[PDB]
Design a protein around this ligand. Structure first.
Ligand SMILES: Nc1ncnc2c1ncn2[C@@H]1O[C@H](COP(=O)(O)OP(=O)(O)OP(=O)(O)O)[C@@H](O)[C@H]1O
Ligand SMILES: Nc1ncnc2c1ncn2[C@@H]1O[C@H](COP(=O)(O)OP(=O)(O)OP(=O)(O)O)[C@@H](O)[C@H]1O
Ligand SMILES: Nc1ncnc2c1ncn2[C@@H]1O[C@H](COP(=O)(O)OP(=O)(O)OP(=O)(O)O)[C@@H](O)[C@H]1O
Ligand SMILES: Nc1ncnc2c1ncn2[C@@H]1O[C@H](COP(=O)(O)OP(=O)(O)OP(=O)(O)O)[C@@H](O)[C@H]1O
Ligand SMILES: Nc1ncnc2c1ncn2[C@@H]1O[C@H](COP(=O)(O)OP(=O)(O)OP(=O)(O)O)[C@@H](O)[C@H]1O
Ligand SMILES: Nc1ncnc2c1ncn2[C@@H]1O[C@H](COP(=O)(O)OP(=O)(O)OP(=O)(O)O)[C@@H](O)[C@H]1O
Lengths: 304, 304, 304, 304, 304, 304
């Protein structure tokens, strides 16, 4: 919904947004939104996501797909009427994203998802990309575990020529829904095949804010190196302004650079990861914050 | 509708158009058009805007979406007839834009929206763009507040990977409608995702004149830096001739250049803004007019 | 319809075509065709024009849109049947353009629309274009007034971010219809937004001949400077062979170059305009004919 | 239909094809096919041509459009069954082109259309093109008259911003049909607007052979000079292998080069035309044959 | 259908494939498959080919088009089932190509079509192409006659601006069907117009194998010289891997280079033709084998 | 379905994945999944694959195409419902790929398909590609036989101008289904024609994982050498990240380089093959492992 501000009320939104990443207990926003999801009546639609055609599929709080739901309309705070309707397994009226209010007035945040190695990590979409000697898949799994902490992490597998991997985009979105509805740390391996149909374009657009609103983190591996300035510059704009955080490999082997976005109109943070392999290619991230200005973000986007 | 002129009648339109920006009380046109909107019978369609498909949705004076409206026709001065009809939640006959006459004979104006720092600001579409060290989002909010003056400003949030942000284009247009129908200062953050479907192309085309007719200002942040001469030159023609004003960052950090268009066939004004940050990234515009000719507008469009 | 010629009958068509521009009373053809329009029975379709989809809308002599019209058939002098039918507000059988014969046997003319500053001006489509320090809008209005002479001129406004401007293409064509049906001098400001859908492509193709057949002049401002060899070369072919006359700005400020096409296979005329501004940006064209060969038309198309 | 040959029967086809251009009385094939058209029962479909959508319209021997025609099937010489059916004004079964056999066994000819200035001219599609100081329209009319001889020539007018010109493609094809059905010499002015929809692409493909089969000549003016290697190389392949003859202007003013194709797999002929203007731009071709090999045809296609 | 191999069974397929071109009596496979076609019950579909839309038309052994055929299913060796159904003149279930088994277990062959000048020629698609002084049409006819031997050859004429030439793609495919069903040597003049719709793309893909399976030869003339790297590289991949043999002209006038493909995974053969013209452009191929490796096939594809 | 991990459970997945390629008996996974297929009730859908339109066709354990199957629903271990439905010969609800669980919890493997010449070969998609003197077809058959070992191999033939070859994409996918359902070693000759419609794009995406999940190997020959950076870079990304293994020819004649992918996030293996020809072009691979890092995979992709 739309929000109204003056100097004073704006000043305290920023104050609150800063707190959401810098001071709030790690993982606490996810906890709060689980409670908001649990207080929804069974059967009520909570999440709608785009399938391959551009049609949307819809889910309840238990990640059950809704097949039929008679028109229901709420009156939001600004007078706006939200209309939800599912017919023959697809959405007939409504919008992609959260069909319930998780954020209320607290919008434009990067709610902290976890602290690891003395670094705070933001929820939203983290894109693991780059070019060269470093391998992305071992990193998403290693980073998934590390941000998992006490919790197990979810692994969505899509579009790779390996056993068990699903290659259907509609099963893929059905996966992501369940994961965001039920888990704080989600790994997508890989995001390559989506990058383009209507529902695929919708995913790139939508998944960052879905995850950021939930307070869960989606860590996706995206591999370019294509060198086609028709597809490599979509794997550069997606990384640019479609992700909340960005993890990109450097010239030094086993070294990665993290660019976290800390909130609406706040200063993007940076830090560097050192990594090594163990038995069966299992990667470990070692333990033992600078502000990064613009034109340095462009200078890092050397993926050609 | 079409308008007929001779030397004399044309001369006084210009006279009136000049007045609309240079001499009229700031914010006074918005006030006049609120009164025209309030004198419309409830239920009567006042605003129609394009959804993602290219179908149009329609609103009343209270920003309520119309679901069914029997065919009504109105005769003009003039000859021309206007036909309005809403069926099953969508427009069946009519046009995108204002379904009521706000402007009458006073057309081609940039009605002054506010005075700030001794500078008059035009209503219509202001696009905040550029390339480099300067951040757009803190500016649209700072400029929104400043033009707000005594009034709060509206913030439409679209297409960013942050908590609370809506990613559905149809919810987005439903936002803009409400904002223009109810508020003098509107902020859109961000315009990036719209830049392309039919309804998206329609928004760029339509929103400038909708806002200028209302006497409200829509301040949108648009970020290029893509360096793809397929998308960066649509973020150059939209900025060029789809906006009423333009705010673009310079080489000097915290400095911005404002190019106001003062009305149909009148001289575009220019001036420079100095800015600094405070607590939690809250931006302030400092306080303490040259005419800019063509080829200097092209010379400023160095976004490659 | 098709026309048959021999040496003798062809020779006198040229004789007549030359007369239509060089010797006939200025504005006299427009007068003749108003009489032909007034001698049409009420309700009978006279003009059909393409809407955005490519469907056509149809008008009577009074610029009233026709909603239902039962199939009527007219036989021509060459044994060809013209079929006209309107159903549910759209054309079901027929053709875009004049649904009545205005020209008879007198075809391929540039009927003189007005004399001003000792120069004859042709009816049809005049495109006001160019690149640099000179402003198009003040010129189309100045030139509109001047060719208006004793008469007021019509001003169609489309696709600019200013108060009152219509941004709907279907309202736009409804404007043009009325204007051509009722006025000798028409101004379109601006043609930029049309330049592409089916109905838009149809307008560029159709409007030149519609206006030339009526003997009314459509003066449209088209602004390129885009520097994209995908859109700037459509604002070069439209100017090239889609307009009857062309008015383009030069290196000298306030100076414009007029290239009139005088008729089917006749010599295109050229001349130069001097202009200055007065109060409130109101432009004046000063008072006090060379034949221009090919390759000099290409040499003038330096809009890159 | 398919044709079967051996050395002997092939040798006499070539013998006959050569005769069709080099020795047969000029215009005699057109006369023969008029007789074949006159011996068709009224109402029977003789010609089908593509409209804008790709649907086909159909005509009888008198150039009357057929609206309803019940399925009729003939058995051709090779066993093949030709099926013709018109329903609600459009073809339902059949093919574009001549729905009756005009050629029988005499196929692959360029039947001589006229002799003028001691030069034989072939029927089919003649494309008048080029770049520079020379004007195409005066030439198509001059060449139309000259090949007309004792007969008047037909003038189809399409897609120019002049009075009387039709801009609807469907009226355009309805013109061409009538002209080919009723006249030996046809002029199309101009072919520019067709060069692209389905029905337009169909015209370029189909009209050469339609005219060649009839023994009538279609002289079309096509103007490039666009310098866009997306449209200028379609105005180079159409000229190349979509026309029977080609008339192109040279560096010398008023001089044109004719490249006639004399028949299936025979030697293309060349010759040069000198021209001058008279009163009202009426062009005259002066009076007082070399074989042109390949790579010299490419060397002449200097339209960039 | 799928085929299963081991070392031994594979070794004897190659043995048989080699024999099919190198040792079998020229023209003997065509004879065998005529017998297989003659032992099909009347009415039973034998050949299905793609029309312009991508729908398929179907034929019986006598080249009669089938209009209605009730669903018939046949069991294979093998497991696999083949379903054939024709409804309202089009295929409703099935596949493009031979609806009966001509090849059985003998697949991947280039069955010898004829011996001429002491050279064996393969059946399948022969593409006659090149750039320069040499003419393609006289060659396809000369080569058609030579491979015809004791038999007449079929001539399909498509897409040229000459008398009798068909320009409708659907009549074109109806021709090819008949020709392949009834004749060993077929000539297509020309293949230029097909090179693109769905049915056209289908022809290039399908006709090589249709002809190779039948043991008939389709000799098609394809002319590029366009110099557009959007169309000239489709007249380079079609020639490359869409034809069984390739006949291309050299720098020396009247000399052509033949590249025969001798069978699945066997060595492509090469040889050179000398030619001269006689009366009425009738070409003769003179009388009085090297293996060509890869990179020499690319080195010959100099058509730019 | 989605999978949940911690440090410990992830560590043993890698342990298991490594085992699946490095230590498990060659061909043993294929054996296991045949048992899982045999324990499915007759009629139950097991495999769904995309036809040309993007619709899916469905098969039972015996490779019989399913025509009608009433909606059946199965619950997973993670609370997700799989819905399968076939109506009028096409899938109405479900997903492309295996409609039964073959992999359970053992996902992201490259199950070893065979050992040959002391080298383990992975199942999945092997693409045989390259540029130059070496021939692909003899290799896919040689490699097919060698990995076949004690078993015969299946040969799917598609899109080549040779006798017996199928050119219909729908018959093609029907082949692949049967082959994967019934055989451990499959050869596709060739993949060229698929490389683009919806169903074709789906095959590239889907076939790698289908085969890897089955534990069968699909060896496909793909030939580029096109030198068009619109099609050659799709024959570079398909080879890159759409195949499990890659076999590419080198500068030395008869020598090939094998790049095996050993499993999800494990080290890709490399080795070199020496080959020679025998009688009738039958190729033999000679008998008498290094880890290949990134940037060396790019350095090998020199196919321009
Ligand atoms: N134990 C190890 N020691 C050294 N290098 C390793 C080890 N395990 C994996 N690698 C390297 O890291 C990469 C991991 O495989 P993977 O294919 O997932 O990398 P990636 O960069 O994510 O590419 P993709 O997009 O194809 O998944 C391999 O290319 C491999 O060379
Ligand atoms: N207090 C501050 N002092 C200096 N620089 C700041 C401060 N706060 C923010 N910035 C800079 O201004 C930018 C504001 O954030 P933001 O990313 O919203 O800008 P933006 O141009 O809108 O980019 P985006 O489109 O990614 O949101 C940051 O990139 C940051 O580097
Ligand atoms: N009195 C004046 N003196 C000098 N220059 C003027 C004067 N009035 C207007 N101009 C110039 O002419 C232009 C008129 O404005 P306008 O926006 O109509 O031009 P335009 O070329 O039609 O642009 P657009 O195509 O966006 O409408 C302005 O750019 C202005 O710089
Ligand atoms: N009497 C004449 N004397 C000298 N030149 C003439 C005469 N009449 C016409 N021309 C020239 O020949 C051309 C004829 O006009 P026209 O526009 O038909 O030429 P074109 O080359 O066919 O171009 P288009 O494609 O626009 O028709 C004009 O450009 C004109 O300059
Ligand atoms: N008797 C002959 N002597 C020398 N050259 C000849 C003779 N007959 C024909 N030619 C040449 O061979 C070509 C044969 O004509 P044709 O145009 O059919 O060849 P083509 O390559 O098929 O071209 P197109 O595709 O235009 O038909 C001619 O261009 C001609 O120059
Ligand atoms: N005995 C042999 N000695 C040398 N070279 C051979 C031998 N047999 C085959 N070749 C070469 O290998 C290739 C095998 O033919 P084939 O057409 O199957 O190759 P390909 O690369 O698969 O081409 P395509 O992709 O068109 O099928 C031939 O080009 C041939 O030159």
């Amino acid at each position: 919904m739309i929000h109204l501000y003056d100097a004073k009320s704006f000043a305290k939104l920023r104050a609150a947004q800063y707190a959401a990443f810098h001071t709030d207990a790690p993982g606490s926003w996810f906890d709060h939104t689980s409670g908001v999801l649990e207080s929804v009546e069974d059967g009520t639609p909570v999440l709608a996501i785009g399938v391959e055609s551009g049609d949307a599929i819809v889910f309840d709080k238990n990640a059950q797909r809704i097949v039929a739901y008679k028109e229901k309309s709420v009156k939001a705070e600004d007078g706006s009427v939200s209309v939800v309707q599912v017919e023959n397994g697809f959405m007939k009226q409504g919008h992609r994203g959260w069909l319930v209010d998780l954020t209320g007035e607290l919008v434009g945040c990067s709610p902290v998802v976890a602290e690891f190695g003395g670094h705070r990590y933001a929820s939203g979409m983290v894109i693991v990309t780059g070019k060269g000697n470093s391998g992305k898949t071992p990193l998403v799994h290693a980073l998934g575990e590390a941000l998992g902490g006490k919790d197990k992490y979810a692994t969505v597998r899509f579009g790779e020529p390996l056993s068990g991997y699903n290659t259907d985009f509609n099963v893929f979105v059905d996966d992501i829904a369940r994961a965001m509805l039920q888990h704080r740390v989600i790994v997508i391996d890989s995001l390559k095949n989506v990058i383009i149909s209507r529902g695929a374009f919708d995913l790139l657009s939508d998944i960052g804010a879905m995850a950021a609103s939930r307070g869960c983190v989606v860590i996706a591996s995206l591999n370019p190196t294509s060198n086609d300035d028709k597809i490599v510059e979509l794997v550069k704009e997606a990384s640019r302004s479609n992700s909340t955080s960005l993890v990109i490999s450097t010239d030094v082997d086993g070294e990665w650079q993290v660019l976290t976005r800390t909130g609406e109109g706040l200063q993007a943070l940076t830090h560097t990861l050192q990594t090594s392999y163990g038995e069966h290619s299992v990667l470990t991230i070692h333990t033992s914050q600078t502000v990064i200005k613009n034109d340095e973000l462009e200078s890092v986007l050397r993926r050609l």
